[PDB]
Amino acid sequence: AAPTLTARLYSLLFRRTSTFALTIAVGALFFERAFDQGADAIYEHINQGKLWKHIKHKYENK
Amino acid sequence: TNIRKSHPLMKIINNAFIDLPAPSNISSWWNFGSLLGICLILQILTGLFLAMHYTSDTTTAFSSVTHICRDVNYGWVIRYLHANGASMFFICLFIHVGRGLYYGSYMFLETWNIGVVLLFTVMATAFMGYVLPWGQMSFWGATVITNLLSAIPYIGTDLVEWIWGGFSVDKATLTRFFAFHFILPFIITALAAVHLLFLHETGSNNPTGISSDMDKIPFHPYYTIKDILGALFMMLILLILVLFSPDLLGDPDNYTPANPLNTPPHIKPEWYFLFAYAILRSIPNKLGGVLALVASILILILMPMLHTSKQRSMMFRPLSQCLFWMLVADLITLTWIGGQPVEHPFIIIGQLASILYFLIILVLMPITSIIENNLLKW
Amino acid sequence: TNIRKSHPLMKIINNAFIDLPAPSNISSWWNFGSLLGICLILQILTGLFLAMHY
Amino acid sequence: PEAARAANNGALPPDLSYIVRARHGGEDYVFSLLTGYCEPPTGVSLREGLYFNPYFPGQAIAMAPPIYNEVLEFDDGTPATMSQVAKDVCTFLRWASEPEHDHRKRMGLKMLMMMGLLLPLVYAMKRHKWSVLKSRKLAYRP
Amino acid sequence: AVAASSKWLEGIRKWYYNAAGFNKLGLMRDDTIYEDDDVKEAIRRLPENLYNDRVFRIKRALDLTMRQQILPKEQWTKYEEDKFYLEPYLKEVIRERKEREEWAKK
Amino acid sequence: GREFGHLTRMRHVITYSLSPFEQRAFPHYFTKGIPNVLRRTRACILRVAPPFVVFYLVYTWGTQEFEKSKRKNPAAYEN
Amino acid sequence: TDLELHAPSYPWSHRGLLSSLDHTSIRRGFQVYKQVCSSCHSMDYVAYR
Amino acid sequence: ATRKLCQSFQTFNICYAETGLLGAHFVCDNMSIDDMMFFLQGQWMRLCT
Amino acid sequence: SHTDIRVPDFSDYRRAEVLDSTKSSKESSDARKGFSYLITATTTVGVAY
Amino acid sequence: MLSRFLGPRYRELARNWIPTASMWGAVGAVGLVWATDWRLILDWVPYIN
Ligand code: HEC
Ligand code: HEM
Ligand code: HEM
Ligand code: HEM
Ligand code: HEM
Ligand SMILES: COC(=O)N(OC)c1ccccc1COc1ccn(-c2ccc(Cl)cc2)n1
Q1: F4 to chain H nearest CA, in Å?
Q2: Active-site annotation holds for B226
Q3: Which GO terms describe its cellular component (chain E) (predicted)?
Q4: Which of E35, F11, G29, J45 has the fewest other C-beta atoms within 10 Å?
């Protein structure tokens, strides 16, 4: 009866609910700068060649 | 020695939100009472911003609002949070009233009567906020109220002159409409604490209409996590209407400025007043039309007296369920008629639907409950 | 059946202002707590006027 | 406005900084009126200052047609025909009415991605507490 | 009180009993009554075995509505097996209220 | 005076419960849930829906008779 | 006063839900207001800023 | 004893060959169950730390 | 009698690692009580919005 | 069914209470015009001008 990989770190960090009181602060990363994969790479792909920083090399260093 | 049962301030919170006995079969229709408390708080922390940068005069009102969407930083998001946040308040209010009408919650007499006062106060507040931006719909919508407000046979001509700042359309008109709009949302916040103190004497009703004292659960954690999930689904719908179509609920003719320049192509208010504008417009008398406007909201107070069924709710009453949904389809008709011009098919329809709204509540509903009483052999 | 001892809103007022036990030798120096509540209400119904025209 | 309508035979042409937010067509109405001129049909006897535009309220705008082929030539080189003239000025006057257009839609994309995380996770937390009541059994032994 | 419609009006009574659905939750008709002051005095006067039967039937129906479920069709309450256990106790409570009211005006 | 030890009188009733960590939070979801939400739809469809059908027929008759009272004039348009 | 003609739906390049405006077609359309008009229309709410 | 919260309590250690039960039993009146469960669980947590 | 009282069967609700009634659930409990549990933890990194 | 007004003993309900109210339906014509700044009863008497 080998279990699955849901014993994540339950015996290591999550038992004594020390994590739960401060996940607004401590467990808070991986979801602003790791989501450069998110909206900005999607939004500029639907609007390729239409934003200002696409038509930009045409009008500096002239 | 349990601190949440003995501290003088903590034990008020514990009896109200934590250890409160609640029925176990409460549905999602009981979510909209805490949603109304979220919408009222949100309209206060957003009306802070707008009254800060504001000037209310006949010469600068239309431009004081256009200054915020372009020049004032984070002003386009906060203005359309406020205009759509008031449409969100009114859809959470009509669901809330129709719940208590369907399940017989008006038998809590003191809680129901403070509710009818709360329905009048938010309706009069939002009327005095749409007059503030001063466009075509702000002018011609305000100047049909005072035609029926000067129709009061003795005191009416000095009543409208006392609230118009002193004469007519002028600088100080929007100093008494704006005064009656800054301060009325705070009488609502005090009337809501009294509204819940009367409900605490009995606890909540439930969808079966039978008392549930043998099957109570604590409010925490079962309905604290269910009210948080329902509030998150409300913020998703509100931010979709703000960030993807912020002018869907609105009228373009209120971007044309206010002046007695020219008669507009139409006159219509926001969507949550279209049922009331359709009723008074189908009465060709400015005194009979102002009486049936107040009689369309204060008719809710007669609902405890008109009850003739032996059961409380409508869960086991199939003939009464048909009449409840005929009343909802009658209010959809009046919302459509109230945005139509006054022409041939929209006068015979708009005045027969004004009759059927009063015929269902007063005559058809008390007779049908008696017929269902005889069929169950009591 | 006494309505000021059994109504849910009236019994809060009765315990706070009417039937409240108070010492009998309280002086005039104990008057200034309700005077502070009069001065705070007055500064609210007068700051209404000034922020209107401002 | 005294000298305005005297220059235009009793009509003041309005301001345009909110003109597509103030009509029931958006920027589709401004385009369809700039390029929709016709001649007055049989029976429509119009007065001194009326040119027959069928996309106008009252059919009788006091507006001679303002644009035609090459009233202008652009800075980078673009054939300046009449529809191309009107299509570009109707991409103007919409940015003017709504200068928050592209910021409104990019902020709406991060909203839909964050509430695609928060909502299935609050729902399964609610599902965890309520499973005690959903699985309970009752028995009556008098 | 018509002898020609003796069976026809009992067909409409049996139809309305099934259109209403307290029998699908295992309830009797007197379980569903609205409890005003005359009903609350009649519950206090019930014998101890009829009181305990009513309390369990209401708790089982509240638990079914929480789950949005109903009972199997062989466990539904039949029309000609529904016992009006509360009706003799309620007619006596109301007769006593109407006696104290004729006395207060005469 | 509405607290948990003082509510009502109850005799001879037994309840059994499981811990939330001992059960799966998602049991039969499409096996039970889809047949359940379909007979709930069938039980309420004859009460709710026929009022909203009559609103649809009045709306279509009201917008179509508005146009052919106005400027739609094929044959009643003579001397 | 009889009927009215409503404008059709043109497939603009900003019509979609996640669509931006074309920032070359605003530059070309500013000069249709600047040098072909402002002989009748003010635009009193937009600046050169 | 100070608040007159119960009639009695006891702690037990029941052992079998591979498992067992480790806990407590108490007797009280109908308005004292919530306070006695609160104080007992607070003593288990005060021994874990 | 009270010895006629037994718990009804809960097999169609249990997690898939405790259906066996003979294994003593030593390591199939701490590696089990984690299913809806970073569900609760990755919720509160999403509340940082 | 509000027939509590219709009784043969409480007809003296209204006979002990209306001798209070001999002016009380017209105190608005005595007392409110003290603050209306109208001339409702100010023409009745040469008491006031
Ligand atoms: C021939 C002078 C003239 C020219 C040049 C002109 N207009 Fe007009 N237009 C008018 C007049 C006059 C009115 C107002 C007519 C009235 O109010 O009866 C008007 C009205 C309008 C309206 C309102 C139409 C309506 O339905 O109310 C719009 C929009 C408009 N003009 C846009 C433009 C644009 C864009 C340009 C630049 C391509 C332009 N106009 C150039 C004369 C002109
Ligand atoms: C600002 C307006 C309002 C607020 C903040 C508010 C708030 C609440 C809350 C929090 C509840 C308890 C939870 C619930 O059942 O939803 C409630 C219940 C109730 N409300 Fe309101 N409400 C408002 C308006 C109204 C109106 C307009 C009415 C009726 C005309 C009303 C009548 C009732 C009734 C009868 C109940 C008890 C329903 C039951 O338990 O079945 N309320 N309200
Ligand atoms: C129950 C709460 C409220 C409701 C229903 C409400 C409703 C409205 C409405 C309908 C408008 C018109 C918006 C538009 O037409 O564009 C508006 C704007 C306004 N509100 Fe409120 N409001 C509420 C709270 C407040 C508060 C708390 C304040 C002041 C602190 C306030 C002050 C204003 C002002 C000054 C405006 C004009 C600004 C503008 O038009 O954008 N309102 N509100
Ligand atoms: C807005 C400010 C205040 C208001 C409305 C207020 C109001 C009151 C009232 C009504 C009383 C009871 C009657 C009395 O004994 O006078 C009272 C008592 C008291 N106040 Fe204040 N007060 C305020 C500020 C303060 C301050 C600044 C302090 C101390 C730093 C304070 C400390 C006390 C104490 C200790 C008592 C009880 C005194 C006794 O019974 O001997 N209060 N207050
Ligand atoms: C605790 C209550 C208050 C205190 C102690 C207080 C104190 C003051 C003071 C010292 C001034 C300056 C007057 C002068 O120098 O001529 C003033 C005026 C002013 N206050 Fe207040 N105030 C209170 C309440 C309020 C309220 C409730 C409002 C707004 C609703 C408000 C808004 C203003 C404004 C706008 C002025 C304008 C300056 C003037 O008209 O003289 N204040 N108040
Ligand atoms: C958002 O504001 C509007 O819709 N307003 O007012 C500026 C408007 C605009 C144009 C035309 C008409 C109106 C108002 O139409 C109605 C019809 C009924 N009420 C009403 C108002 C208060 C109360 Cl207590 C009860 C009923 N108002």
Answers
A1: 9
A2: yes
A3: mitochondrial inner membrane; respiratory chain complex III
A4: J45
